[PDB]
Amino acid sequence: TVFRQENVDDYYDTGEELGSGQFAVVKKCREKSTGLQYAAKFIKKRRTKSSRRGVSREDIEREVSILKEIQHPNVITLHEVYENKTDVILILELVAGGELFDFLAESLTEEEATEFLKQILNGVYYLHSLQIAHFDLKPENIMLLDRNVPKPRIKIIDFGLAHKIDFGNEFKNIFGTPEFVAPEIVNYEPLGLEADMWSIGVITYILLSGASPFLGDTKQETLANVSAVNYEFEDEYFSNTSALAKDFIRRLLVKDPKKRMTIQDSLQHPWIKP
Numbered sequence: 375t376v377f378r379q380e381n382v383d384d385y386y387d388t389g390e391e392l393g394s395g396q397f398a399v400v401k402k403c404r405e406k407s408t409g410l411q412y413a414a415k416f417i418k419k420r421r422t423k424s425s426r427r428g429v430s431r432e433d434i435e436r437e438v439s440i441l442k443e444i445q446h447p448n449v450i451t452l453h454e455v456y457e458n459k460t461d462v463i464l465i466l467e468l469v470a471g472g473e474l475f476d477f478l479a480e481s482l483t484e485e486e487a488t489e490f491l492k493q494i495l496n497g498v499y500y501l502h503s504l505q506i507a508h509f510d511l512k513p514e515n516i517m518l519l520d521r522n523v524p525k526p527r528i529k530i531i532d533f534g535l536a537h538k539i540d541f542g543n544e545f546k547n548i549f550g551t552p553e554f555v556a557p558e559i560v561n562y563e564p565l566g567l568e569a570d571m572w573s574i575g576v577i578t579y580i581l582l583s584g585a586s587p588f589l590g591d592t593k594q595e596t597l598a599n600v601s602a603v604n605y606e607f608e609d610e611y612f613s614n615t616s617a618l619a620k621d622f623i624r625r626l627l628v629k630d631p632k633k634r635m636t637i638q639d640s641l642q643h644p645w646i647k648p
């Protein structure tokens with residue numbers, strides 16, 4: 375699939391840089407024709423077939439195809455796609471409250487955690503209902519619309535690892551951030567929606583405690599801990615946390631994906647269900 379090949383600068387003015395990663399940079403922009411503001415994600419294309427720098431066309435097209443399908447209050451909205459020889463440029467909904475990661479750097483109550491978590495679950499429920507696994511859920515990929523309100527609204531971003539799961543599982547060596555990946559990712563096993571539910575359990579543990587359940591001193595230790603389900607609720611962090619909150623996490627941090635809570639289970643779990 376080919377994208378708009380007019381110069382993006384003919385239609386948008388960029389401003390503040392919002393973030394950057396290994397193959398991408400995100401810049402605030404303003405559409406000239408409407409004055410409406412967006413985030414422009416410039417994704418570096420692979421320059422040769424056998425190269426390791428940049429993102430392969432197949433991966434870019436998969437991300438774009440997924441983004442075009444989704445319209446939900448808790449998932450980012452793709453506005454337009456441009457491309458040139460060097461980049462594909464996603465024009466994306468502007469979310470100005472920063473990463474949930476950075477907000478957390480500023481521990482939550484269970485109410486504040488569940489207010490965030492319920493929106494994450496609603497967004498993931500939407501994705502999983504479309505058989506979309508995100509595969510990269512973590513606080514860095516949860517953006518807040520406005521971080522200066524009591525109950526910030528959030529949107530899931532960064533679908534660069536997301537896959538349609540139309541056969542129940544994908545076997546592709548998808549692999550995200552060690553602290554958040556499920557054991558099946560660590561072990562290079564077939565992957566499905568269940569891996570997102572593990573990541574939600576990790577997120578929930580962090581939200582409630584400010585601590586990462588599997589984090590080791592090195593990436594290999596983290597991955598080894600994940601595969602061994604080597605975590606515990608440290609009393610120093612969880613002494614005032616309800617047993618039901620711990621129960622929620624414990625039913626997500628389950629090695630066997632078939633025994634892990636699904637997104638529907640998580641919404642019916644007594645800690646979440648009204």
Ligand SMILES: Oc1cc(O)cc(/C=C/c2ccc(O)c(O)c2)c1
Nearest residue numbers: 392413450467468469531532533534
């Ligand atoms: O700091 C910001 C602000 C913003 O408004 C959007 C993003 C990124 C959105 C995004 C959404 C979907 C994707 O697949 C993706 O790679 C990135 C980052």
